[PDB]
Amino acid sequence: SSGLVPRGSHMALQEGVNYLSGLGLSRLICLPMALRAAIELNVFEIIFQAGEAQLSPAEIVAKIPTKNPNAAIALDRILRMLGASSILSVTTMGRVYGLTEESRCLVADKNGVSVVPMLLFTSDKAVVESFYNIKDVVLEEGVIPFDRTHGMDFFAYAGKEQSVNKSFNQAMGAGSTIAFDEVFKVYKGFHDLKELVNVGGGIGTSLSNIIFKYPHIKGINFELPHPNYPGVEHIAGNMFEGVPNAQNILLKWVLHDWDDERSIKILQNCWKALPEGGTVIVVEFVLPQILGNNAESFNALTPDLLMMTLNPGGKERTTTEFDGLAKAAGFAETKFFPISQGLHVMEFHKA
Amino acid sequence: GVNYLSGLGLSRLICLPMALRAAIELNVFEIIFQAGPEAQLSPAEIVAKIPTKNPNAAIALDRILRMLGASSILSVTTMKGRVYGLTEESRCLVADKNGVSVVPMLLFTSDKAVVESFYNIKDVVLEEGVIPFDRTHGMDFFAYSVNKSFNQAMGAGSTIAFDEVFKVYKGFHDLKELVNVGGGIGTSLSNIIFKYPHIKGINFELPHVIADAPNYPGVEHIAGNMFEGVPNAQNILLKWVLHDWDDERSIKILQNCWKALPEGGTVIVVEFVLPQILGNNAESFNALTPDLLMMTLNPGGKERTTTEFDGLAKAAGFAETKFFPISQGLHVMEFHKAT
């Protein structure tokens, strides 16, 4: 950075509160809805296909299935908002728009994975409608905002509206693939395992991907009664009643669905299923001890608030809190492995 | 190497306005303010001022406040939990000495009926002449609680804007006569004349609106249609009118103003303007956000740059445009008829 900056004298303060600047807080609702529209119009892939390209609104709508003659002027009102917010790069000539580091993740990789399914689910109408009632969690004990908004719970609602069910399933699948891609680069604890029981989790995709990379692991997928992957045996059951005997257990985004008392009971059922020397491997985002405006913080705060609206008993936790859960279930040794951006793998070791 | 893991954090964009709305509705910002200047309060201290039975209210509240602190809407100090205070932007969420804040506008732009319509904004790109609100709710916006939210949003915004106009712009002091085009029942013009009592005021509005209007000091009511003609007067006020209309209709209004003015007369225009270069700042979003709301609610209208406003005035026959920037994208513009 060029330039010499003297400490110098103290900046003179402005007088009064300028309420006109506070009107700009309306940017907070407009930006996510503008982003959602641009995702649904495929703007980011259209830009990417052009190659550090920057495209005019006319060039972008040329690739959108519309015949609306005013499409470009309409689209520019949306793109202007994304450019002002640094989601798109802008050159003012009208304006042309390109990708930024922030928006590269909206373009699917070689294997078709991006963050788009997560973003579309977390801003889905049924979820956003329930966010209007998040304050009820403060005011009334035991109220679930989604249930109050829709008169049924999230999974009952998703079973009626298949559009919400596809959207949720694709979101969890994308997030899991993204997180495990990073886990497999950093975490070394699968290396010498011979058996792993996945407790919770769903269809068995994450476990099958572990066994692909660690072919000596014999997998068991343990799940509630409702696609068999080789080397993955499927067992139906309720983890609050018991867990099948296990050399090692995998808990991938399970504990954050449950309050402390229920998370402790899951881990106690894990403890009694393990032999001496067995391990629980926990994959979770961890709340940083000091929050700030950074990816580590928002990767924990965002699922925390979505949980508050869909399932307020669940919550995100700090490393200290995770260690507290482990000790309440009788584990005496805990190991923490930072992966990236707040994602951690934790090992709870049975004596 | 694309960082997809960090990109999952873009879901924070929907979480932040909903946490902010919850905190406004829990009255969090006024509770912090009443603790005194530079106060920072724990969640337990804030919950003690909120009527609730719930023994876990403080823990639940911290889940919302944490988000606003991490996003810089609240200031944060970490004790051994966090304490929260106001920042420059959240100070605007507390009423000032004149009783008003930006809260009504924030609550309207994130209101349920508005946000539900935002889901169909892509239909404006895809299908000619679709109005997102109409497709969402099966009827017009004015045909469609919500009317309360809308009126108070527009009233708070106008009150905040004009309190600043009056401080910065000195062009009302020596006017002798003023027509307010689209003045409603004339309240706003009456309040201008209260501040500047030498102005002779004319409230000009459609007949069914003026039918309900009371008598105000210094104000004469005249009924009619601004697209056919405007009353003769020395000066004309267009406050928040032109952004409701496309270029052709705006030029027609201004051509009617030009006809109604004497040589030397002026149109005074109060609007937010789009900056030439957009940035992550209120000067950009104070025009971008109304523009998106109109796309969802009032097709036809649009926000404009200063250069575009000059273009309208010159096309309507005015000889000079004169700009008085107020703050944060708000401008007064004078369009002068040649003498």
Residue contact B278–A83, C-beta within 8 A:
yes
> Is B158 known to sit in a ligand binding site?
yes
Residues after which a C–N gap over 2.5 Å breaks chain B: 80, 144
Residue A223 annotated as binding site: yes
Question: Mapped to the 3 state alphabet, what secondary structure does B127-174 carry?
Answer: CCCCCHHHHHHCCCCCCCCHHHHHHHHHHHHHHHHHHHHHHHCCCCCC
Residues B87 and B174 in one domain: no
Residue A77 and residue A123 in one domain: no
Of A26, A25, A20, A13, residue with least CA distance to B167: A20
Hey, what amino acid is at A277?
G
Q: What is the CATH number of the domain that holds A237?
A: 3.40.50.150
**What resolution in Å is listed for this PDB structure?**
1.9
- Distance from the B200 Cα atom to the nearest Cα atom in chain A, whole angstroms: 30
**CB A210 within 8 Å of CB A219:** yes
Give the residue among B186, B338, B321 at the shortest CA–CA distance from B242.
Answer: B321
Strand pairing partners for A72?
none
- Identify the experimental approach: X-ray
CB A117 within 8 A of CB A173: yes
For residues B268 and B327, membership in a common domain is answered with yes
Please give the helix or strand (H or E) that residue B64 lies within, else none: helix B57-70
CA angle A261, A286, A246 (to 5 degrees): 60
Question: For residues B299 and B123, what is the distance between their CA atoms, to the nearest angstrom?
Answer: 12
Q: Which residues of B are catalytic?
A: 243
B122 shares contact with chain A (CB less than 8 Å): yes
SS3 B304: coil
Q: Is the dihedral of CA A126, A127, A132, A138 positive or negative?
A: positive
Whether residues B8 and A123 touch (CB distance < 8 A) is answered with no
CA-nearest of B83, B335, B101, B295 to A23 is B101
B281 interfacial to chain A (CB closer than 8 Å):
yes
Q: Is B328 exposed, middle or buried (0-12, 13-18, 19+ CB in 10 A)?
A: buried
Which candidate from B67, B164, B288 shows the least CB-CB separation from A305? B67
Q: How many CB pairs under 8 A join A and B?
A: 290
The answer to whether A15 and B152 have CB atoms below 8 angstroms apart is no
Q: Name the 3-class secondary structure at A93.
A: coil
Taking the mean position of all CA atoms in its chain, how far away is CA A228?
26
3-state secondary structure B81-99: CEEEEECCCHHHHCCCCCC
CA distance B13 to B67: 11
Beta bridge partners of B222: B204
On whether A176 is known to bind a ligand per the annotation, the reply is: yes
- Which chain B residues are closer than 8 Å to A69 by Cβ? 128
H-type alpha helices, A219-335: 260-273, 295-310, 319-328
Same domain, B133 and B36: no
In 3D space, the residue among B190, B181, B169 whose CA is nearest the CA of residue B209 turns out to be: B181
Tally of CB atoms within 10 A around B208: 8
- Residues of A annotated catalytic, as ranges: 256
Which token pair is B23?
């905190």
Q: Are residues A101 and A111 in the same domain?
A: no
Same domain, A239 and A331: yes
Count other Cβ atoms within 10 Å, centred on residue A245: 13
CA separation for the pair A55, A278 (Å, rounded)? 56
Counted residue by residue, chain B has a size of 339
A342: distance to nearest CA of chain B, Å? 9
Q: Helices marked H in A220-286 — which ranges? A: 260-273
As given in the structure block, the two tokens for residue A335 are 């190991």
CA-to-CA distance for B334 and B320, rounded, in angstroms?
Answer: 8
Structure tokens at A158: 């998703």
- Name the residue in chain B with its Cα closest to that of A102: B7
**Nearest chain A Cα distance for residue B36, angstroms:** 15
Cβ distance A302 to B276 less than 8 Å, yes or no, reads no
CB neighbours (10 Å) of residue B191?
13
The helix or strand, by DSSP H or E, that contains position B181, with its residue range, turns out to be: strand B177-181
Residues of A in contact with B19 (CB under 8 A): 134, 305
Query: Which three-class secondary structure state does DSSP give residue B41?
Result: strand
Looking at the 3D structure of chain B, how many domains does it have?
2
Structure-token pair, residue A219: 């997998």
Q: Is A259 on the interface with B (CB under 8 A)?
A: no
- Which residue of chain B has the CA closest to A180? B5
Amino acid at A276: E
Residue A333 identity: E
Which string of DSSP letters, residue by residue, matches B184-233? TTSHHHHHHHHHSTTPEEEEEE-HHHHTTPPP-TTEEEEE--TTT-----
**B97 Cα distance to chain centroid:** 19
B238: alpha, beta or left, given left = phi > 0 and alpha = psi -120 to 50? beta
| Residue numbers in B near A119 (CB within 8 A) | 10-11
- Structural contact between residues B52 and A342, judged by C-beta atoms closer than 8 angstroms: no
Residues in chain A: 351
Amino acid at B314: K
Directed axis angle between helix A260-273 and helix A319-328, to 10°?
Answer: 60
- Distance CA(B258)–CA(B336), nearest Å, equals 9
How far is residue A221's CA from residue A205's CA, in Å, rounded to a whole number? 10
CB contact (8 A) between residue A341 and residue B5: yes
Across the interface, of B76, B116, B295, the residue whose CB is closest to A74 is: B295
Contact indicator for A250, A196 with CB cutoff of 8 Å = yes
Q: Which of these, A96, A64, A69, lies nearest to A80 by C-alpha position?
A: A96
Q: Are residues B266 and B178 in the same domain?
A: yes
Spatial contact of A238 and A266, defined as CB atoms under 8 Å apart: no
Whose tokens are 């139906």? That residue is A236
Same domain, B5 and B74: yes
Last residue in a domain, options B93, B116, B140: B93
CA B157/CA A19 separation, integer angstroms: 9
Residues of A in contact with B13 (CB under 8 A): 28, 31-32, 35, 123
Contacts 24+ apart (CB under 8 A), A332-338: A337/A186, A337/A187, A337/A189, A338/A186
Which uninterrupted H or E stretch holds B237?
strand B235-239
Domain end residue (candidates: A80, A106, A132): A106
- How far apart CA A253 and CA A79 sit, in angstroms, is 35
Which positions 24-63 of B are in contact with A (Cβ < 8 Å)? 25-26, 47, 50, 52-57, 60-61, 63
Find the helix or strand (DSSP H, E) in which B78 lies: strand B74-78
End-to-end CA distance of chain A: 53
The C-alpha atoms of residue B329 and residue B271 are separated, in whole angstroms, by 8
Domain that holds residue A337: 107-351
Give the residues across from A219 on adjacent strands: A196, A232
Per-position b or e across B60-78, b if 16+ CB within 10 A of its CB = bbbbbbbbbbbbebbbbee
Nearest-CA neighbor of A207 among A292, A295, A270, A281?
Answer: A281
* 3 state DSSP class of B337: coil
> Are A94 and A230 part of one and the same domain?
no
Between CA B168 and CA B81, with CA B38 as vertex, the angle to 5 degrees is: 140
Please answer yes or no on whether A105 and B3 come within 8 Å at the CB atom. Answer: yes
Q: How far is CA A12 from CA A9, B66, B117, B283, in A?
A: 9, 31, 44, 22
A169: annotated binding-site residue?
A: no
Of chain B, the end-to-end C-alpha distance in Å amounts to 65
Q: Least CA distance to A129: which residue of chain B? A: B112
DSSP of A134-190: THHHHHSTT--HHHHHHSS-HHHHHHH-HHHHHHHHHHHHHHHHHHHHHHHHH--TT
Q: Judge: A30–B292 Cβ closer than 8 Å, yes or no.
A: yes
Pairing verdict, β A333-340 and B74-78: unpaired
Contact yes or no for B243/B302 (Cβ under 8 A)? yes
Q: Which amino acid is at A83?
A: G
Cβ–Cβ contact A138 with B under 8 A: yes
Tokens of B256: 């009617």
One-letter identity of residue B210: I
Nearest CA in chain A to B153: A23
Nearest to B102 among A19, A114, A298 (CB): A19
Cβ count within 10 A of residue A11: 6
SS3 A285: strand
Tell me the three-class secondary structure of B241-296, residue by residue. CHHHCCHHHHHHHHHHHHHHCCCCCEEEEEEECECCCCCCCHHHHHHHHHHHHHHH
- Residue numbers preceding breaks in chain A (C to N > 2.5 A): 51, 93, 226
B111 and B6 housed in the same domain: no
CA atoms within 13 A on the CB side of B193: 22
Q: Do A35 and B20 touch (CB under 8 A)?
A: no
Domain end (from B76, B93, B110)? B93
Q: How far is A247 from chain B (nearest CA, A)?
A: 30
Do A180 and A323 lie in one domain? The reply is yes
Contact B124 A85 (CB under 8 A): no
Do residue B4 and residue B124 come from a single domain? no
Angle of CA points A318, A208, A198, to nearest 5°:
45
Helix axis angle for A162-186 and A205-213, nearest 10°, is: 20
What is the DSSP pairing of strand A279-285 with strand B330-336?
unpaired
The answer to whether A46 and A39 are in contact (CB under 8 A) is no
Query: DSSP letters of B43-63?
Result: HHHHHTTS----TTHHHHHHH
